[PDB]
From a paper:
PB1 domains are protein interaction modules with critical roles in the assembly of protein complexes involved in autophagy, signaling, cell division, and redox processes, as well as the auxin-response pathway in plants. PB1 domains form homotypic interactions via conserved electrostatic motifs molded by basic or acidic surface patches on opposite faces of their ubiquitin-like β-grasp fold. While type A and type B PB1 domains can form heterodimeric protein complexes, type AB members can mediate interactions with either PB1 domain type or engage in homotypic interactions to form homo-oligomers or hetero-oligomers. Our cryo-EM structures of filamentous p62 and AtNBR1–PB1 assemblies revealed that the presence of a tandem arginine sequence in the basic motif of type AB interfaces is required to stabilize a polymeric assembly.
Author numbering:
A (entry chain A), B (entry chain A), C (entry chain B), D (entry chain B), E (entry chain A), F (entry chain B), ...: 2 to 105
Amino acid sequence: ASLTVKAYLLGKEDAAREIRRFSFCCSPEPEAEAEAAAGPGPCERLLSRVAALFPALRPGGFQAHYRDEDGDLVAFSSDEELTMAMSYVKDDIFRIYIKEKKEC
Amino acid sequence: ASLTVKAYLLGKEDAAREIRRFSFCCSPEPEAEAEAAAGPGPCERLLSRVAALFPALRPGGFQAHYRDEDGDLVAFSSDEELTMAMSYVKDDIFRIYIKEKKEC
Amino acid sequence: ASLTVKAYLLGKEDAAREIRRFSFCCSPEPEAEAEAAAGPGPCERLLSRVAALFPALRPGGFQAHYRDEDGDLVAFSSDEELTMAMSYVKDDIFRIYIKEKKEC
Amino acid sequence: ASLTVKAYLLGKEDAAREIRRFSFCCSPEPEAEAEAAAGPGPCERLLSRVAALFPALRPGGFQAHYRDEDGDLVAFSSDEELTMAMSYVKDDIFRIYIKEKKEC
Amino acid sequence: ASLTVKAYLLGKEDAAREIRRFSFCCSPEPEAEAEAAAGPGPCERLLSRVAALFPALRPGGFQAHYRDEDGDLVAFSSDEELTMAMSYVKDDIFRIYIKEKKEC
Amino acid sequence: ASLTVKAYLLGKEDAAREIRRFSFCCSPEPEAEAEAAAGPGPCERLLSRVAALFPALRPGGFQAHYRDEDGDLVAFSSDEELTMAMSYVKDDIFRIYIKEKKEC
Amino acid sequence: ASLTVKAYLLGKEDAAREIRRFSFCCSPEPEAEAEAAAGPGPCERLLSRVAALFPALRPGGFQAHYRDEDGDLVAFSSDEELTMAMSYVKDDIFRIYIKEKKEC
Amino acid sequence: ASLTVKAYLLGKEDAAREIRRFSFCCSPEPEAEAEAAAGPGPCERLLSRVAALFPALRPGGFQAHYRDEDGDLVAFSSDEELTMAMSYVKDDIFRIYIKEKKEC
Amino acid sequence: ASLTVKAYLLGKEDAAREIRRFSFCCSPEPEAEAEAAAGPGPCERLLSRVAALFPALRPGGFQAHYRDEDGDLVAFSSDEELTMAMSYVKDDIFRIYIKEKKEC
Amino acid sequence: ASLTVKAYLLGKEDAAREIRRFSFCCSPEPEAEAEAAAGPGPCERLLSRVAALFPALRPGGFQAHYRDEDGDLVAFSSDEELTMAMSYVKDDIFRIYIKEKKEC
């Protein structure tokens, strides 16, 4: 399941500041034997890869979102919630919206 | 009864700060024998799951609401009152509105 | 459980004089056999590490605090009370507030 | 009945000098058979635990209070009076106010 | 694989200020023996050549982009992402869009 | 790992008095054999080089800082803490903030 | 390497008081045999020539600066730091900013 | 599945001439045994009920529509197409748009 | 590959007369054994389904189109040309434009 | 060299009557050994494929054109002239204009 993720980085008034467009492999998985318990999570691997590409942000300091049917930026941080996020993929493009974690 | 809960987290002037959109299983229930008295309550399981998802709040320190026909944010904390809250579900989306418990 | 501790050292009017930001390993533990009774405590290892980093203070002469929901600097010195202190961690940052032990 | 007690230690002009925030188990009770007459009292177990945590005070030399509806620091020392003290719990936080027993 | 790169330098309101049009040799590579580990990267050689031509910018202080199918300026800085950038070449012209790295 | 350090020297109201901008080689290391135990530390080599450049300060009499995500000047003096300082590098610029050690 | 240096002399509120615009020969060097150890330094020859032109200042009593990408007046006094200063030359104009050394 | 149908009857320039607002029971179904093959269809029962309410139209002489995401009046006459029509229900209101079948 | 086809039926001045919006299963295929040579074609199954839904047209007497990047109604009748038609799908909606085959 | 050909079929007043948009493989060629002299020509394979797609025309009875820089429909029938036709490809779209061969 080759899945393209188009990571929007949002700015001041929720206008996009930098777009990245990488590829992601959620349903694919490594070798079918346990070298660990079971890897990282599918949302933990996503946020580890969004943090690796953008130079403007550091890992652990950003909140990834998506747009639902109402147009609202629904956040996601879990991997049982990333599966609800990915039911909104249009063609193969999973558009996420990155916002940084400021003061309050 | 698969039931989607869209948890709005309200901010300063009751504008939404973070939206979460999980799923909830009120009328479904576990195995039909008593390993306890009867579990937690259906409102106790809801507020335990809203607190588990949001990183911005800690359990016991938030008040969950809903909108009635007048547009008012009616609070709910009981499980005989959660049944009156859930008579306002529109399609299958049970929109709650989270507010934190500050000074006074 | 990698846990970041941001140690504020408070000054005259409870304004921060020096901030340190180390990492702490409370729930992790050494080898699963007894070379002693059971190590030091998880609060004894914390206050031994806060005293090791700051040159401005000496061990046994400082009181570590935290902020609760009311904004008050609740002190902690026990390890059954450090577990109540650590239920206020926000992302992974456990902010403590150090005050020195003066005359009276 | 898990019950959180936030022990304020009052100072010179009834300003708080040290806050402790422990947990207390009034309505819970041990094994349902008599190894004694009936334990200590529920107020005797409270004041034995407030004295155990604070290093700044010694047992038998402090007066625990609470705030009533008038804002007054009503003292309590009995266990038929601790039950009237605990009808002022707000969420699960039972705020007591400790004052030491000086000269006159 | 002779590949023409038309480097647009963007200005204030994303209007082009200076255009350069050089040639680039991504899939071609030097002698088939290791004088190093493996050269620079194919994106590192691109950004080293864009910085060499423009006198108006200095290396390390510019962000190269491209236009995707939506018309958005998708940035690229990696060499596993330059391969996704170069799937949008039209005839042999790989149009990149240079933006400088200002304050915030 | 070529790493640029931009040393701000702070003044009266934490306004910068002199900026220096040198280069630093933390992860690079000398010849792979022991002429000593293991050199100086990576934080000891940093503070020895900040003291060598500025004529306005003398070695052993300055405290180097950095800004975390909260905007606070977190100090660092150790080399297990310099590794946490250097997880805030933005492009390749590691901005430190120098303050001198006065009376009290 | 003919290199033009435009020496701004800054005044009260960092406004330019006198501009000089001379030429400088950093990478060029004299006869390829040692009449000395190796001349003066390339920063020592620069500050000896800035002091020779301006009548308003005397040698040893001025601090030469440059502007980095942030707009800050980064000072330089070394000749391993003048090489980092000269990576900001725009066409062939190396703009330095002179400030005199007053009381404190 | 109680489902409200708001039947707009369109006029000359696609302006609504009469609105009816009845209720419909698509996913509900009668007794679970075959008194026939399987009833009428779920679209045949809908158009039989729209024709029963409006006095201004006669059955077999009207075309029921719906609005898609583009704002276009997409017609439907089948019951495998009514299931695509009913994926646009907003709260529980299924707005259809009735147009009569004139000359050409 | 669930693929939605929105069939516009064009009228006199290429204005839409009736819209249908069905679903189509191009890349999906039946059981992996040959009961025939290989079914109908993927364009033959499309035009057999567009003719089945619209009552206003009869099979063999309509020309299906699509819009390319120039805005022109490019026709398609082959199944090696339907694969070029379907590279213009936007989200999952494959908009075709039906025109009937009149005199000349 | 994948090359898209957009075949316009011109009508009465040189307005397009049917557009086809196929793909063409001019510079690609079959197996590198002679089963014939050398295939058909690259213009003979083009006009054999334009005649295969359009049902409205028969092979040998149409004249293929292209637009030059003056906007004129320059015809081509040779394969040393098709190479001059294909120097006007814009992105990868080689727009030809088909006209039928009538009386005079």
